[PDB]
Amino acid sequence: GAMDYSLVKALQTAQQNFVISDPSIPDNPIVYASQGFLTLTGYALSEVLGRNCRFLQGPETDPKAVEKVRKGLERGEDTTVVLLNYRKDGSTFWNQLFIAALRDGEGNVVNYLGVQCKVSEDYAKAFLKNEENEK
Ligand SMILES: *[C@@]12Cc3cc(C)c(C)cc3N(C[C@H](O)[C@H](O)[C@H](O)COP(=O)(O)O)C1=NC(=O)NC2=O
Ligand SMILES: [Cl-]
Ligand SMILES: [Mg+2]
Secondary structure, eight states: OGGGSHHHHHHHHTTOEEEEEOTTSTTOOEEEEOHHHHHHHTOOHHHHTTSOGGGGOOTTSOHHHHHHHHHHHHHTOOEEEEEEEEOTTSOEEEEEEEEEEEEOTTOOEEEEEEEEEEEOHHHHHHHHHHHHHHO
16 A cells, blocks of 8 residues: 555655555546645545645646646656645645656556645745756
């Protein structure tokens, strides 16, 4: 199960916000979220399970950031983005998102692991500007 991954347990020891998705199910829904994640977003575990994590996006979320994630998952690439996300109550925060595939011995992606770090506006501002400049 989700907590049997050694890196999941590792992340738990620092109380990091993370989710696990199951890409073998249509639309790659979340199948575990840490307590940190549930508190950040304002949802109960049972509510988040079964949803694709795009439910944290909204009108001011940059579609180009979201497309970086989609492509990374498509192309088999680790991805890190900063993007605007939305809590259950509609209030927003900046989310630095770290995504990687968890693979079996043949390279088949068995789950995705996604770590979320809430970051300040100023940090998001500077990260995105550096991203854009470096690009
Ligand atoms: C989540 C974090 C997250 C973790 C993991 C493991 C996955 C697989 C996805 C996500 N989120 C992105 C979303 O699931 C989807 O991949 C993207 O929207 C890209 O595809 P679409 O163009 O939407 O079809 C998340 N997105 C968030 O905004 N916030 C999160 O916490
Ligand atoms: Cl997805
Ligand atoms: Mg559910």
